[PDB]
Amino acid sequence: IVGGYTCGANTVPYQVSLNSGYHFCGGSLINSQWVVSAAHCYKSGIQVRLGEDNINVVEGNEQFISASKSIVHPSYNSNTLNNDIMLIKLKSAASLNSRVASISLPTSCASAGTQCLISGWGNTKSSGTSYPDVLKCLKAPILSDSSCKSAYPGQITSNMFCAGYLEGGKDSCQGDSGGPVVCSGKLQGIVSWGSGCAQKNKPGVYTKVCNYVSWIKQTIASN
């Protein structure tokens, strides 16, 4: 996250870190057994880390649970990033508490102008590289589909939305991928892609979670 703020420990209780020896992507806890992330974060050997603030220090609220199964969206296309969503099942159920909590799925899509919270352990610099140990947060609005499409000609599908600031300086970034965009208490986006980070006229692009609620629910119901 570039241009954000330190969230505070366990203030984003649905945020997970995906670990394969190291943090590599975010995700969102949606029930005691399942995490939502980006399909481009897929890899074998995932350990889901819940209850994290400093990802390099054991602080006392963590739950580390290996993934039993990952399900990339049936129609994910890694070239275009269309349908950049996956589900990860935990080998054991998380113990839910005030610091480890699921986030609700949306019932309808969000609208441009809606304020959201974006979070992660990704790069905090737009030129250069600095990875934080503690969780970072950014409040940002959803942008109109027309402004999104104009910013990224030929690239924005109906399964994507833009959020952030056209002036630059405030965005998600590499290492935030897979993490949450939460608006009014609902998971509306997944950190997906963008041109660099925090660049003028290049807002963040996010997977449009509302399009996937039926798939998520049916997948969980049979897995």
Residues making up the binding site for substrate: 171-172, 174-175, 177
Q: How far apart are CA 85 and CA 165, in angstroms?
A: 24
Nearer to Ca ion, 52 or 171 (CB): 52
Q: Would you call 133 a catalytic residue per the annotation?
A: no
- Among 40, 73, 119, 192, the active-site one is 40
Nearer to Ca ion, 59 or 145 (CB): 59
| Cβ-based neighbour number of residue 158 at 10 Å | 9
Measure CA 143 to chain center.
Answer: 17
Q: Would you call 84 a catalytic residue per the annotation?
A: yes
Q: Would you call 40 a catalytic residue per the annotation?
A: yes
Which letter does DSSP use for residue 106 in this model? P
Measure CA 100 to chain center.
Answer: 16
Measure CA 201 to chain center.
Answer: 22
What minimum distance in Å lies between the beta carbon of 24 and Ca ion? Answer: 15
Q: State the binding string over 28-67 for Ca ion (x if CB under 5 A, else -).
A: ------------------------x-x----x--------
Residues marked as binding? Answer: 52, 54, 57, 62, 171-172, 174-175, 177
What minimum distance in Å lies between the beta carbon of 65 and Ca ion? Answer: 14
Rounded to 5°, the CA angle 164-15-26 comes to 70
Where helices occur in the chain by DSSP H, the ranges are: 145-151, 213-221
Nearest to 102 by CA among 189, 13, 27, 38: 13
Residues marked as binding for Ca(2+)? Answer: 52, 54, 57, 62
What minimum distance in Å lies between the beta carbon of 176 and Ca ion? Answer: 17
What minimum distance in Å lies between the beta carbon of 109 and Ca ion? Answer: 34
Q: Which amino acid is at 69?
A: K
Q: Under the rule (CB under 5 A), what is the footprint of Ca ion? A: 52, 54, 59
Q: Which residues are catalytic?
A: 40, 84, 177
